[PDB]
Amino acid sequence: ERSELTIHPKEFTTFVRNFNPFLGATNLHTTTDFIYEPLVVFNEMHGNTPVFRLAENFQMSDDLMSVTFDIRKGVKWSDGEAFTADDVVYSFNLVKEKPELDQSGINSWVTGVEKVNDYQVKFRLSEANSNVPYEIAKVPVVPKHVWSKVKDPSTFTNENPVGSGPFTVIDTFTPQLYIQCENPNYWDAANLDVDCLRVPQIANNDQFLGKVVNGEMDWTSSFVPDIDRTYAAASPKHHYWYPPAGTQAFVVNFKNPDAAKNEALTNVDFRRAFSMALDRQTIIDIAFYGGGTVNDFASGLGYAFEAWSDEKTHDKFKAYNSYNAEGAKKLLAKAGFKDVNKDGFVDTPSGKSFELLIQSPNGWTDFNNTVQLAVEQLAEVGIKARARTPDFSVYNQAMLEGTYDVAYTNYFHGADPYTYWNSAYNSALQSGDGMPRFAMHFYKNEKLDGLLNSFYKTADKQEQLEIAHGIQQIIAQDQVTIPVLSGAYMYQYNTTRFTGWWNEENPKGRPNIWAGIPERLLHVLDLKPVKLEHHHH
Ligand SMILES: CC(=O)N[C@@H]1[C@@H](O)[C@H](O[C@@H]2O[C@H](CO)[C@@H](O[C@@H]3O[C@H](CO)[C@@H](O)[C@H](O)[C@H]3NC(C)=O)[C@H](O)[C@H]2NC(C)=O)[C@@H](CO)O[C@@H]1O
Ligand SMILES: [Ca+2]
Ligand SMILES: [Ca+2]
Ligand SMILES: [Cl-]
Ligand SMILES: [Cl-]
Ligand SMILES: [Cl-]
Ligand SMILES: [Mg+2]
Ligand SMILES: [Mg+2]
Ligand SMILES: [Mg+2]
């Protein structure tokens, strides 16, 4: 009687009812896009082509110091009230007044928002930035007529959401399953053929594997080991498409509170020897079953941005980011990391023993295995390390608070190098209660920040390329992180119950179901239920 699409955007041990789009640490990951539709979805796989949703147009000013957005008329909230400029203006003012709700750093860019009329908003910028409509689209727009009356938006759980997107009705909710049904007032209802999102609680990759192999899922983006043998071979309806994704690296804490570990981690010779100890292709072969590409760029750029790469820089530092056990041992010796207590593990120049604790998230088994391989490879050059696999929130918090030693992490990936470099190295993103982990190495370089903040400042493509080369040089020469590989956008789909999926023959955009992939809105608008085959009673 209704089509239910079973999706898996995020692992949870238990579902807590939270649909606050600003509360990324604690909300459910079907809130953004599916409850709160964006102004615009930029199709990152297709050159950031803008797909207009609740806005029908935007227009930048002469000098890139402002931009105006035109709001689509006739759009209703799920309670029947009108979607207008009022809501956009309020949402941005809310994030400005309460910066712990800024999860992107939008406050650094937008100094003010002004209602031009009921269907146009103007944004004033702190600085010139041709990329700011992209930034603006990241901010959730919530209904002012509801949220302005809310006690405290920063602690509002929003259990009965009023939304603009396709699925706003909470049909069923249990700690282990919830079902999110069609917005009865959805502006783009004629384009939508899925009735409900069905979201089961899955805690880790182990629990996932059993369910996906058994055909219990429709749309997922989890790591699956030996995928051809385990999942694809199980049914002719089991499909996948793994387009290339972003950089993954070992990130070291430059502000480690332990004296010995700080001494090691802040030493560029040590970071380079660490990096040379790793066998990146073996990590890809074993931990990812071949699903990745070696990243031997000291700057972490990766091979998917060859038009952008300064090949002289890449070549200069590539040796430090290539498997070379003997080279690593020789460098540790030259630097003065000498074993002075006969245990085969190097000690710091001041003579102190230490063991690096390397963390990755609990249940992210491909990363867990990567870390364990690295532990073994590090031991072969005399670097003592051991693995920890803390709960994601604990993992995350340790990075935010700077209490970790080394962490393995992936990064956002975009149509140009700025998505990675800015999110991973801009020191402004090292502070703020809404900030993610990505820049939390606490390396700070003012010249680097300056180049990043200038990337979209001139409409001059050659200058922008020179800025990129400058960024690449700084990060490479300082071996700020230890890049390992370029990963994949894991994505599995089931044709048993639905058709219309994006895939290698229909590569319309990033196909993943994770929150933070706004294209998943466009994707679900393409899916159509299948007439089930008849069976007993
Ligand atoms: C609050 C919010 O919207 N946060 C978004 C954040 O969750 C997104 O980060 C992605 O989250 C998914 C889910 O945890 C990550 O997918 C996992 O990758 C592991 C490593 O390969 C696999 O072992 C897991 O199987 C897989 N889990 C699932 C359920 O698919 C994904 O790696 C992660 N990406 C990054 C980068 O952190 C981001 C990006 O979409 O957006 C929001 O920040
Ligand atoms: Ca209103
Ligand atoms: Ca020793
Ligand atoms: Cl509801
Ligand atoms: Cl496919
Ligand atoms: Cl490089
Ligand atoms: Mg269950
Ligand atoms: Mg419809
Ligand atoms: Mg459609």
Residue 271 in contact with ligand 1 by CB distance below 6 A: no
Q: 265 and 185 in one domain?
A: no
Question: How far is 317 from 338, CA to CA, in rounded Å?
Answer: 24
For 96-176, list the strands marked E by DSSP.
110-117, 120-125, 167-174
**Nearest ligand to the CA atom of 184:** 8
CB 483 within 8 Å of CB 298: yes
Of 111, 143, 175, the residue that ends a domain is 143
Q: 220 and 300 in one domain?
A: no
Question: How far is 331 from 317, CA to CA, in rounded Å?
Answer: 14
Please, which residues bridge with residue 8 across strands? 220
CB 454 within 8 Å of CB 467: yes
CB 140 within 8 Å of CB 39: no
Question: How far is 176 from 202, CA to CA, in rounded Å?
Answer: 8
Residue 458 CA neighbour count, 13 Å, CB half: 11
Ligand 9 centre to CA of 53 (Å) is 14
Question: How far is 358 from 373, CA to CA, in rounded Å?
Answer: 11
3-state SS class at 148? coil
Question: How far is 513 from 136, CA to CA, in rounded Å?
Answer: 22
CB 475 within 8 Å of CB 425: yes
CB 107 within 8 Å of CB 53: no
Question: How far is 339 from 332, CA to CA, in rounded Å?
Answer: 10
Cα separations in angstroms, 255 against 44, 275, 386, 432, 478: 34, 19, 20, 17, 16
Ligand 9 centre to CA of 500 (Å) is 9
Contacts of 316 (CB under 8 A, 6+ apart): 476
CA dihedral 278, 280, 286, 290 (to 10 degrees): 180
Q: What is the resolution of this structure in A?
A: 1.8
Question: How far is 173 from 285, CA to CA, in rounded Å?
Answer: 40
Q: 358 and 395 in one domain?
A: yes
Residue 432 in contact with ligand 1 by CB distance below 6 A: no
Question: How far is 49 from 41, CA to CA, in rounded Å?
Answer: 8
Of 89, 120, 143, the residue that ends a domain is 143
3-state SS class at 251? strand
Q: Which of 7, 412, 514 to mutate to test the pocket of ligand 1 (most atoms within 8 A of CB)?
A: 514
Q: 226 and 153 in one domain?
A: yes
Q: 128 and 247 in one domain?
A: no
Q: 303 and 208 in one domain?
A: no
Contacts of 535 (CB under 8 A, 6+ apart): none
Q: List Cβ<8 Å contacts ≥24 apart for 341-349.
A: 344/382, 345/379, 345/382, 345/383, 345/384, 346/382, 346/383, 346/384, 347/260, 348/260, 348/263, 348/264, 349/263
Question: How far is 285 from 93, CA to CA, in rounded Å?
Answer: 48
Give the residue among 23, 295, 311 at the shortest CA–CA distance from 155. Answer: 23
Q: 303 and 361 in one domain?
A: yes
Q: 177 and 108 in one domain?
A: no
Give the residue among 408, 404, 406 at the shortest CA–CA distance from 366. Answer: 408
Residue 34 in contact with ligand 1 by CB distance below 6 A: no
Q: 355 and 463 in one domain?
A: yes
Beta strand pairing call for 196-200 and 219-220: unpaired
Which 8-state DSSP code applies to residue 140?
P
Cα dihedral sign, 448-450-454-460: negative
268-277 vs 325-335: helix axis angle to the nearest 10? Answer: 160
3-state SS class at 108? helix
Question: How far is 442 from 453, CA to CA, in rounded Å?
Answer: 18
Which two three-digit tokens encode residue 476? 């490479």
**Number of neighbours of residue 64 by Cβ within 10 angstroms:** 18
**Ion ligand 5: residues, CB < 5 A:** 239, 241, 503
**What H or E segment, with its residue span, contains residue 250?**
strand 244-252
Give the residue among 22, 104, 21, 96 at the shortest CA–CA distance from 423. Answer: 104
Residue 366 in contact with ligand 1 by CB distance below 6 A: yes
Ligand 8 centre to CA of 186 (Å) is 9
Sheet holding 196-200, edge to edge: 167-174, 177-182, 196-200, 4-8, 219-220, 492-494, 238-240
Residue 269 in contact with ligand 1 by CB distance below 6 A: no
Question: How far is 410 from 392, CA to CA, in rounded Å?
Answer: 13
Beta strand pairing call for 385-388 and 356-359: parallel
Which two three-digit tokens encode residue 397? 């918090």
Question: How far is 96 from 108, CA to CA, in rounded Å?
Answer: 9
Q: 165 and 19 in one domain?
A: yes
Give the residue among 324, 309, 312 at the shortest CA–CA distance from 275. Answer: 324
Ligand 1: nearest atom to the Cα of 412: 36
Which 8-state DSSP code applies to residue 32?
B
Sheet holding 293-294, edge to edge: 293-294, 482-488, 244-252, 406-410, 356-359, 385-388
| Domain limits for position 90 | 37-143
Of 121, 143, 165, the residue that ends a domain is 143
Residue 223 in contact with ligand 1 by CB distance below 6 A: yes
Phi and psi dihedrals of 164, rounded to 5?
-110, -20
Residue 506 exposed, middle or buried by CB count within 10 Å (0-12, 13-18, 19+) = exposed
Q: List Cβ<8 Å contacts ≥24 apart for 322-328.
A: 322/276, 322/296, 323/276, 323/278, 323/279, 323/280, 323/281, 323/282, 324/276, 325/276, 325/277, 325/377, 325/380, 325/381, 327/273, 327/276, 328/273, 328/274, 328/276, 328/277, 328/381
**Number of neighbours of residue 160 by Cβ within 10 angstroms:** 12
Q: 258 and 228 in one domain?
A: no
CB 9 within 8 Å of CB 513: yes
CB 104 within 8 Å of CB 135: yes
- Structural biology method used: X-ray
Tally of domains within the chain? 3
- CA 156 to chain CA centroid, Å, is 24
Amino acid at 200: P
Residue 514 in contact with ligand 1 by CB distance below 6 A: yes
3-state SS class at 170? strand
Q: 136 and 187 in one domain?
A: no
